[PDB]
Every structure is written in C-alpha cells, then in structure tokens.
Paper text:
One of these highly populated repetitive folds is the αα-solenoid (SCOP a.118), whose most widespread superfamily is the tetratricopeptide repeat (TPR; a.118.8). The ﬁrst crystal structure of a TPR domain showed that the repeat units are helical hairpins, stacked into a continuous, right-handed superhelical architecture with an inner groove that mediates the interaction with target proteins. Here we show that such hairpins are detectable and that one of them, from the ribosomal protein RPS20, can be customized to yield a TPR fold by repetition, with only a small number of point mutations that are neutral for the parent organism. We concatenated three copies of RPS20-hhta as an initial construct, connected by the TPR consensus loop sequence (DPNN).
M4NΔC is M4N without stop helix. We conclude that in the amplified constructs, the observed interactions are more favorable than the interaction with the native stop helix, releasing it and rendering it prone to degradation. This led us to ask whether this helix is in fact dispensable. Indeed, an M4NΔC construct, which terminates with the B3 helix, showed the same stability and dimerization as M4N. We obtained two structures for M4NΔC from different crystal forms at 2.0 Å and 1.7 Å resolution, respectively, the first (CF I) with two dimers in the ASU and the second (CF II) with a single chain in the ASU, for which we constructed the dimer by crystallographic symmetry. (a) Two dimers in the ASU of M4NΔC CF I. (b) Dimer constructed by applying the crystallographic symmetry to the single chain in the ASU of M4NΔC CF II. All three dimers superimpose to the M4N dimer with Cα RMSD below 1.9 Å.
Author numbering:
A (entry chain B): 1 to 105
B (entry chain A): 1 to 107
C-alpha cells in the first residue's frame, strides 16, 4: 500500500543517484512494517550501496532472523560480510544456503 | 539520451505496469554499451521481477562471463538458478563464490 509507494519513490531517487533521500523514504517504509523482509533487504542494499556496510549488515541480520530458510537473504548477507572481509561468517551463511538448496531439491 | 535516463525511465515504466516499454528502454540502455555489467544486471533484475526468469539468467550469465570473480554476480545468478529448480548448477556457483572468498582471505 503506502509501503509500496514509499518503496517506489525511494528506488526512483536511488536509480537517479539520489541515495540519501531514497534512504529517508525507505526508512519510513521500514518503520511502517519493521518485519517486512523485502523492505529490510531494500534498506540494507541502499545502505551498502553507499559504502555503509555495517548498518546494512545489521538490517540483513534482522531480515535473516525473520526467516532463516530464505536463500536470497542468506546469500545477500554472505555477500555483505565477504565485502567487509568477514570470510568465515560469509562462507558459513553461503554454505547454509547451499544446504537449503540441496534439501529442497 | 544516456544509459542512466533510459534505465530509470524503464524502472518507472515497470512500476506503472508498462513492462513491455520498460524492457524496450532497458534494452536500449544495454545497446549503448553491451558489455556493461551494471546495465546487464539491471536488465536481469527487471526481467526477473516481471517473471522472465530464463532471460534474466542469460544476462546474468553474460555478466559472470565478463567478470567471473564477482561474488555478487555469482550469488545472484545462483539464487536465480535455484529458483528455477536448477539446484546443482546453483550450488556450483555458490561453491565457486565460497572458494573465491577463502582464496581472497588467504591473501
């Protein structure tokens, strides 16, 4: 609803290279529903796109905690951790994703 | 106009449910610089969100081929493949990514 609208505006501003405003609207969107995985991941990726990897990782951990079996979230978190030089933890989450993929098949 | 303009126009068009036009403009953006990894990933994401998973996979594969050590590209591709039910190849890309992370960590 309003979350989707805020998300659209945010992503438009970001795709136009105006990331700070995008982050403002995104934080609003997350505030409206703090348990939405999609919006949390969106916020995270916007923060990471700005070089702020730590806060991004925070929100990604939140999203993972919301659903530990989603391989997209696990993979994304793993990527963020790897970019920050946390090899062991990244490899851990990636391998968890591998296990889930192999299990579902 | 530029790649940025065409790409964002494509994004808003997609948001308006004008997927055909969106893909048109995003492909126009690609044509200006066919080996641009960023644009390729953008088109891939667009195709994926519209349901066109297979095409998206093809463009993600080209992206990987342009830079095979990018773990973001490898991971995104793997997630897509797994989504389409291609478990083994997805796992292969993820283990590639893991090997790269370990290799980079070892210095």
């Amino acid at each position: 609803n309003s979350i989707k609208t805020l998300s659209n505006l945010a992503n438009l501003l970001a795709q136009e290279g105006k990331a700070e405003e995008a982050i403002k609207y995104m934080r609003k969107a997350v505030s409206l529903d703090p348990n939405n995985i999609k919006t949390l991941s969106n916020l995270a990726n916007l923060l990471a796109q700005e070089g702020k990897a730590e806060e991004a990782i925070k929100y990604m951990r939140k999203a993972v905690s919301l659903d530990p079996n989603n391989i997209k979230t696990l993979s994304n978190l793993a990527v963020l951790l790897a970019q920050e030089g946390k090899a062991e933890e990244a490899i851990k989450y990636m391998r968890k994703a591998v296990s889930l993929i192999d299990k579902a098949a």
